[PDB]
Design a protein around this nucleic acid. Structure first.
Ligand SMILES: [Mg+2]
Ligand SMILES: [Mg+2]
Ligand SMILES: [Mg+2]
Ligand SMILES: [Mg+2]
Ligand SMILES: [Mg+2]
Ligand SMILES: [Mg+2]
Ligand SMILES: [Mg+2]
Ligand SMILES: [Mg+2]
Ligand SMILES: [Mg+2]
Ligand SMILES: [Mg+2]
Ligand SMILES: [Mg+2]
Ligand SMILES: [Mg+2]
Ligand SMILES: [Mg+2]
Ligand SMILES: [Mg+2]
Ligand SMILES: [Mg+2]
Ligand SMILES: [Mg+2]
Ligand SMILES: [Mg+2]
Ligand SMILES: [Mg+2]
Ligand SMILES: [Mg+2]
Ligand SMILES: [Mg+2]
Ligand SMILES: [Mg+2]
Ligand SMILES: [Mg+2]
Ligand SMILES: [Mg+2]
Ligand SMILES: [Mg+2]
Ligand SMILES: [Mg+2]
Ligand SMILES: [Mg+2]
Ligand SMILES: [Mg+2]
Ligand SMILES: [Mg+2]
Ligand SMILES: [Mg+2]
Ligand SMILES: [Mg+2]
Ligand SMILES: [Mg+2]
Ligand SMILES: [Mg+2]
Ligand SMILES: [Mg+2]
Ligand SMILES: [Mg+2]
Ligand SMILES: [Mg+2]
Ligand SMILES: [Zn+2]
Lengths: 136, 126, 192, 37, 23, 176
RNA sequence: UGGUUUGGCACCUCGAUGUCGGCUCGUCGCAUCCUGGGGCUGGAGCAGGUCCCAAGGGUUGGGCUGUUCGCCCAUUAAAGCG
RNA sequence: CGGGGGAUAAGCUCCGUGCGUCGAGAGGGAAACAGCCCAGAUCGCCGGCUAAGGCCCCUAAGCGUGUGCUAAGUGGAAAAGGAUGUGCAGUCGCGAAGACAACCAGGAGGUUGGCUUAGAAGCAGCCACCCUUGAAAGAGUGCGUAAUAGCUCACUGGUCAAGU
């Protein structure tokens, strides 16, 4: 559960959802990484669930990284009410993603266990993804 | 095993044969590791007993005139070299074979000529 | 530490523009431009297949000798661009060079060895800048780690280098770090 | 006759075959035997 | 429902180039 | 392919005749007919052997070559020797006896169960607990063997039923 | 996936679309209550748990609230969901 | 087409567009279908040439020609995911020094490695995952017993013969 402390304005427009990624397109820091292809949004709950999933399988050794943060908010008004008449309230936070961006990275000398854990993580997210290696 | 390993083994067995006065061929099938270790301990005083593969030994035999043994390498083969003396190793193998009943002596090599099982028995007795 | 040139062929581009460039790309040709102190830019084509072969054989940085209309030249692959998704070589930069020049080249570094059970291996920096002669560029650098404990910060300067090379990056740069293996409690605490 | 959209060779002794357009795995252990559908 | 999916899917006939009134 | 390459041997004491696609064989045990698949042709070697050839290496030909070869080998070996199977019954108070061409079983049901013997096969019993079945066609032998086997449900507890010669059934013990 | 409850859009009908249950009378689907056939079991057997195929027939009578819903009284194989 | 309100929902609503059409527009095309494609009706002619779409019969025109794919009525309903289906293109490894599978022998000795437990011997768990003889033994992928014990397997030798 990662939440930003404060923001100048507490709500914004819908996230931009077109184009191809520009920066952070190369796996770097550790030895293995994950990159996505489709376009969607990811939230703190999903991030934490994926982190716990990778944790409970990596167990003793290794250590992870996260390259995103759901800071941009989204709004949702009380249910069963006439639309309009004012904004709703911010309920859950998300961060956008574009093809080529790197989501997670890992370092663990046992390649097979590392790959199996990473596949466990991939089978989790709501976006198509695949594993990548540090070497070109 | 790599081709380099095969060449190294060929050279090793060739030099061992060159440095050994004579040698014999036996069958190692159906023998328990305990009895193999016992035989190795018994023979270690004078001779050396190992295992070699048919194709490798056939290729290595081209150096000397031991090429006549090619027909005796059909099936499992165990190779024993006698660096010292000639007869004591033969007696040891004969007694071990007649005790175990699971070892058959394929033949031997003496004075540049292959000799059959009866000749091996006679020369061992001598 | 000596290497040998890799031979290739090239042709002069007839048209300049995105349309023709990516038409050639689809056909199977990778456009390229060469330039240097000679003050004479030239833009050519290269065979993608042999280009990839040479790169995979001799790393990112390799010595290339090019045949253009019967003329010979020596060039270096200064920079490369890779499609993030398709991993294609859209364009490569060639820098002419003659024997006996000082050039700035980025070189990768690898690490190998055995680590104690109570230690973990991390690599903050994967490439280190090294200056040397054009024909004397190492293909890779290696560092051996054995029986290290606790803080064993290895600086770039500490790394052994071959002769005829100079370390341009400041020695204070940290390349390899080794730390105490983590604990489950602290690891789970992280990011809470 | 575990019926799930996806099947796997749960243990090493599972083998996969194709029948009448439907693919299922047979194994000595009945627990390891299932068909998709 | 089934009704809705039909008309939108039936719009993908090459005759109309894919664009039709009312989706 | 690999299994169809080797020609099928033919002994001297068997007659073989070929009429286009159809093939018939005459031997001491009897005679049988056969129709062969059209994609594959069959030829007879002058050295008392049968050679089967495929025109092309596609999937259907690769599949049918081996099938034709093995089927020819099976039918020739059957007409030469034949086929027999032995059966045994385990349990307490289980019996079997022969009445002419018909055979009856006693597995402990309230009423007896009888099985008719179709043509081309015969039933032989040497002991009240063991019998055998004989015939010429392996497929018929196997069919009748399976039918006889399926009389009783599997019993992984006491093993009561009918079991083949070398067939071992898993057994699990119920504590309660 | 279904559009069957509570919901959002006002597009056909304010020179009229008459309204909840009950009585009588059907017709249809299967996401199966029994009746039918199988398999896996932490399946001695009776008896249980779960999955698969299957829509020919049946699915009581009473007390309480107008009630829908719901609780209760006595048997049968069941007192099925829309 | 570029946007806001909405649950990135509506055949929803509110904007901007020297933007199209219908409204105020027949014909032909998609079975029927105002807002989609082509095309702008002065009138007559038992005349020729064409756009959009079509050429087995309904129904006018090709059961056209040349090279390739399809076993599913996919053609003629949709996603996470799964799989010894299949063709093309590219790999490294091994392969006549006998590849792979298949069909005989050996797969052992400190050893029950320590903590843990009633119990831990290879198989509830944690640490090294050390080493010996070798051809090969992995603190052993499992289905085996409370714990021993067996069935084994990993790599490897003997026979067949090239793809794996
Ligand atoms: Mg940026
Ligand atoms: Mg996903
Ligand atoms: Mg599952
Ligand atoms: Mg729309
Ligand atoms: Mg209205
Ligand atoms: Mg109206
Ligand atoms: Mg009205
Ligand atoms: Mg009225
Ligand atoms: Mg009415
Ligand atoms: Mg009413
Ligand atoms: Mg059903
Ligand atoms: Mg039932
Ligand atoms: Mg059940
Ligand atoms: Mg039914
Ligand atoms: Mg009926
Ligand atoms: Mg009342
Ligand atoms: Mg829009
Ligand atoms: Mg919008
Ligand atoms: Mg409106
Ligand atoms: Mg408007
Ligand atoms: Mg108009
Ligand atoms: Mg009109
Ligand atoms: Mg019309
Ligand atoms: Mg006009
Ligand atoms: Mg015309
Ligand atoms: Mg046209
Ligand atoms: Mg016509
Ligand atoms: Mg046609
Ligand atoms: Mg063709
Ligand atoms: Mg269809
Ligand atoms: Mg799909
Ligand atoms: Mg998949
Ligand atoms: Mg073994
Ligand atoms: Mg030990
Ligand atoms: Mg343990
Ligand atoms: Zn299994």
């Amino acid at each position: 559960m990662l939440i930003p402390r404060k923001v100048k304005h507490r709500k914004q427009h819908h996230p931009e959802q077109r184009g191809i990624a520009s920066g952070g397109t190369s796996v770097s820091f550790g030895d293995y990484g994950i990159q996505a292809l489709e376009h969607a949004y990811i939230t703190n709950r999903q991030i934490e669930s994926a982190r716990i999933a990778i944790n409970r399988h990596i167990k003793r050794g290794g250590k992870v990284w996260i390259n995103i943060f759901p800071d941009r908010p989204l709004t949702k008004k009380p249910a069963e009410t006439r639309m309009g008449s004012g904004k709703g309230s911010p309920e859950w936070w998300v961060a956008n993603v574009k093809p080529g961006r790197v989501l997670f990275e890992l370092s663990y000398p046992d390649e097979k266990t590392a790959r199996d854990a990473l596949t466990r993580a991939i089978h989790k997210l709501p976006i198509k993804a695949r594993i990548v290696t540090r070497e070109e | 095993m790599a081709k380099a390993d095969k060449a190294t083994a060929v050279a090793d067995i060739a030099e061992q044969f060159k440095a050994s006065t004579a040698t014999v061929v036996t069958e190692y099938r159906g023998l328990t590791v305990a009895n193999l270790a016992e035989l190795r301990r018994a023979l270690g005083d004078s001779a050396t007993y190992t295992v070699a593969k048919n194709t490798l030994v056939k290729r290595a035999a081209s150096e000397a005139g031991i090429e006549g043994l090619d027909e005796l390498f059909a099936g499992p083969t165990a190779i024993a070299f006698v660096k010292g003396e000639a007869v004591d190793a033969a007696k040891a193998i004969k007694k071990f074979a007649k005790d175990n009943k699971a070892l058959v002596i394929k033949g031997g090599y003496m004075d540049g000529k292959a000799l059959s099982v009866a000749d091996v028995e006679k020369i061992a007795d001598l | 530490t000596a290497n040998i040139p890799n031979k290739l062929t090239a042709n002069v581009r007839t048209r300049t523009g995105k349309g023709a460039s990516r038409q050639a790309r689809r056909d199977g040709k990778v456009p390229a431009v060469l330039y240097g102190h000679g003050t004479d830019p030239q833009h050519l084509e290269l065979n993608a297949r042999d280009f990839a072969a040479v790169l995979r054989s001799h790393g990112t940085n390799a010595i290339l000798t090019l045949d253009i209309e019967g003329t010979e030249q020596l060039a270096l692959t200064k920079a490369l661009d890779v499609h993030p998704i398709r991993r294609n070589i859209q364009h490569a930069d060639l820098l002419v060079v003659q024997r006996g020049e000082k050039v700035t080249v980025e070189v990768t570094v690898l690490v190998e060895g055995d680590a104690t059970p109570g230690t973990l291996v991390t690599q903050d920096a994967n490439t280190i800048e090294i200056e040397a002669e054009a024909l004397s560029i190492p293909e890779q650098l290696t560092v051996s780690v054995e029986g290290v404990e606790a803080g064993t910060q290895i600086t770039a300067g500490q790394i052994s280098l071959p002769e005829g090379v100079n370390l341009i990056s400041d020695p204070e740069l940290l390349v390899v770090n080794v730390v105490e293996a983590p604990s489950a409690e602290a690891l789970e605490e992280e990011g809470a | 006759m575990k019926v799930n959209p996806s099947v796997k060779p749960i243990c090493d002794k599972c083998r996969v075959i194709r029948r009448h357009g439907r693919v299922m795995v047979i194994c000595s252990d009945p627990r390891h035997k299932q068909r998709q559908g | 429902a089934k009704r809705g999916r039909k008309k939108r899917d039936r719009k993908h006939s090459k005759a109309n180039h894919g664009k039709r009134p009312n989706a | 392919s690999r299994i169809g390459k080797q020609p099928v041997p033919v002994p001297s004491g068997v007659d073989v005749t070929i009429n286009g696609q159809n093939l018939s064989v005459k031997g001491p045990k009897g005679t049988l007919t056969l129709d062969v698949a059209e994609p594959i042709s069959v030829s007879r070697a002058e050295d008392g052997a049968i050679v089967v050839t495929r025109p092309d290496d596609e999937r259907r030909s690769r599949s049918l070559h081996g099938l034709s070869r093995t089927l020819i080998a099976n039918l020739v070996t059957g007409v030469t020797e034949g086929y027999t199977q032995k059966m045994e019954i385990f349990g307490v108070g289980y019996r079997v006896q022969l009445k002419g061409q018909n055979l009856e079983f006693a597995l402990g049901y309230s009423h007896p169960v009888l099985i008719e013997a179709p043509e081309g096969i015969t039933f032989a019993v040497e002991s009240p607990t063991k019998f055998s079945v004989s015939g010429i066609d392996k497929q018929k032998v196997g069919q009748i063997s399976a039918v006889i086997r399926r009389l009783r449900r599997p019993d992984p507890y006491k093993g009561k039923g009918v079991r083949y010669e070398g067939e071992q059934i898993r057994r699990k013990v119920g504590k309660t």
